[PDB]
Amino acid sequence: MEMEKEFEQIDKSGSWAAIYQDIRHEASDFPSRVAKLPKNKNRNRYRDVSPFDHSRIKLHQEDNDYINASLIKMEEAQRSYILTQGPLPNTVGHFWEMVWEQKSRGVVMLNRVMEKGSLKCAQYWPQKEEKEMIFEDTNLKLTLISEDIKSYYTVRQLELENLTTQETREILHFHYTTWPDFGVPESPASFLNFLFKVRESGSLSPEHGPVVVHCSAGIGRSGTFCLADTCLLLMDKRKDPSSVDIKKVLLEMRKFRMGLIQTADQLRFSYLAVIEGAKFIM
């Protein structure tokens, strides 16, 4: 079926939970043996969210190459994404090692450091220009260059230096600051505006490594971001845009990381975002 009228049909019939459970039942199951090794317990935020072995990002390190991060490679759309958990106190150095080694231009953050009175990720970037951060375990330096605070999101320019080679690179940090503590946004308008700002920066383009996107576990809000982006790109590429099937795209992405889209409300919000976005594109 088309999207917008499939949407109204699920609303009127109140069957979002059943649609979402079908997706959960059909989703791929692949091994995640490296994630479960005892030496990696303090590298995982949640025991039930792990990267598959076949798609995990490997650190270029012979001691321990593990990080909780997955490469989502979308062949027809010609887009790739790295989805990862919010960094932990003992993985902030690994996080920036990955950014460096994978040649990423942008980092997309969809959570606040504290939500619901608890810490959802480490404070992994500097908050003042004159107070830079040094990660001694991976030999990197990170400096805040500029910060632009808007009503729904903040953009930061960061300098990452490899202290071993003295090479430097500019990284863009796109921080969506207004996702509510509970539920999903009432309108997708600010989330779509944010997606377009990431696109306009070059951070999603083939001349760079894959964008790094995270929330707390790296599957819920993060899944919503890449699902909406990929569906909109396919609607532009194809002769028949109404042939884009959001459920089929989601199952393809779940071949590369488990659990993408965590609730039936997030699924409904993803439909809403693609529907409204397809009108603005034209």
Ligand SMILES: Nc1cc(-c2ccc(Cl)cc2)n[nH]1
């Ligand atoms: N004067 C000045 C420096 C910069 C700059 C420096 C370093 C990065 Cl990574 C990005 C921008 N903009 N303007």
